[PDB]
């Protein structure tokens with residue numbers, strides 16, 4: 001910053017619609033299918049976003065795809081939680097302008113427990129009085145928060161990149177604090193918030209995987225990219241071959 005901050009703010013994705021038909025009565029098939037589609041559409045914005053981040057191209061072409069394919073879920077949840085807080089003060093999950101989840105939908109989606117956790121994450125944005133800038137940095141960092149236990153092709157470039165994004169988050173915290181104790185206190189809070197995202201993602205990873213398996217049974221449509229990623233990338237995470245990077249133990 002100003003350089004770093006300018007970029008993140010300049011590349012922040014715009015509003016993405018789900019294409020849901022809010023005129024038809026709610027149903028598991030319709031709601032989940034809409035969530036899946038929204039996922040596809042968003043995945044495209046995430047790829048272009050990540051491929052605009054400072055130094056992202058320092059990563060091997062294969063690792064570039066790897067990081068996105070593993071962290072998309074977390075990235076989308078953290079971003080969904082930020083929208084819910086700013087647009088409806090966490091009252092409901094603001095997936096998209098045409099896809100807002102109230103208590104009833106949280107129930108009909110059959111993933112109420114997961115909606116509760118995500119909504120709790122949204123509430124954190126308010127309790128911790130997270131700023132738009134702190135949010136942007138954290139989200140950028142989420143892209144580099146999950147890798148295979150055996151590392152990537154060019155692991156070194158990844159470490160350097162992750163290290164630099166952590167440094168940037170530090171400057172964001174320092175560029176608005178006089179006390180040397182307030183800074184350390186904030187960083188602690190932010191890393192705690194970042195970690196709390198992984199557990200929520202894993203539960204969604206397990207849920208979507210199971211849904212994909214019995215998709216044909218429950219009449220739930222899965223976009224092309226979503227189906228491929230969930231049947232090839234997600235399993236690696238659920239089997240322990242790929243794991244998130246926690247700040248705290």
Ligand SMILES: Cc1ccc(C)c(Cc2nn(C(C)(C)C)c3ncnc(N)c23)c1
Nearest residue numbers: 043047051061064065066068069225229
């Ligand atoms: C070769 C290359 C160059 C840049 C990026 C971001 C990637 C990862 C990447 N690309 N794509 C397509 C092109 C199918 C939309 C992806 N779709 C889903 N997940 C991905 N990680 C990616 C790959």
Ligand SMILES: C[C@]12CCC(=O)C[C@@H]1CC[C@@H]1[C@@H]2CC[C@]2(C)[C@@H](O)CC[C@@H]12
Nearest residue numbers: 035036038039042076077080095204208
């Ligand atoms: C990432 C999405 C879609 C993008 C968003 O705003 C967050 C939201 C979180 C729940 C995901 C959904 C995509 C489709 C999934 C993966 C369903 O299959 C089950 C959980 C859904």
Ligand SMILES: O=C(O)c1c[nH]c2ccccc12
Nearest residue numbers: 004054055056161164165168
């Ligand atoms: O700030 C970042 O994210 C950076 C990634 N690669 C770099 C090289 C020099 C300075 C900052 C960065």
